[PDB]
Amino acid sequence: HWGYGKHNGPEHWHKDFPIAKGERQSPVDIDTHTAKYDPSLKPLSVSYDQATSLRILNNGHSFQVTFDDSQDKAVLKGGPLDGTYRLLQFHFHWGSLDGQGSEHTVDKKKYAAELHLVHWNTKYGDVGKAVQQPDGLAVLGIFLKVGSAKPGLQKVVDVLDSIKTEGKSADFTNFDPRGLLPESLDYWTYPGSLTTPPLAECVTWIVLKEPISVSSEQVLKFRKLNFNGEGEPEELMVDNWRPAQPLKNRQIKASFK
């Protein structure tokens, strides 16, 4: 089964998921000097006030916080998007060291981690149908750098001890994902894919230009999670990031000058 190790990592994924070598794979390097400001791009609308978080879960590749997406409660609109995209879950990708961990890169710079808030287009009715559409999902990507603590992340960090290994989950209600956002909603956007299998080419990527800072203690707690399930040889959940993929016939647009 797929993972991030030598024998099951990103270089192997194409064998089970041939779209791994497709025309709109993610992540990508964002070359800031080649990205073009698109004045027709609207501001992002991040409407998270009614977000209803449900569970936090270690799925063996990351940890994710899931939300009630059965109604328009936490939605992403605007920017490059047509229509309404419901927040389903967020998760992170991170490194074994502070100089790697992000999936997208900016002028080849790797951040310590990357937060993905995964949303799906309500015109497709459910996320499984949305994954089958080229405009089915919108992932809001936010870089993490190590510096000062992010207070809105602490509640996540506080609970990771309870989901150390693959398959463990915990109640994670009343979590406000607005606490994970940077000040600026300036973004780059491009059409891409899920960065984990099945690598479906269904994502409008919206990557914020402003990172959030998290503390060394916060990221260290990410790195104490396990890829393995309980009772198996302990393999720390670190470096669960896919590297940048070929941009191919795509233009990255910037919402800002």
Ligand SMILES: NS(=O)(=O)c1nnc(NC(=O)C2CCCCC2)s1
């Ligand atoms: N790293 S990422 O591009 O944000 C992602 N890679 N696979 C992702 N799968 C999902 O979100 C789903 C969750 C539930 C049902 C379908 C899909 S999200």
Ligand SMILES: [Zn+2]
């Ligand atoms: Zn992700």
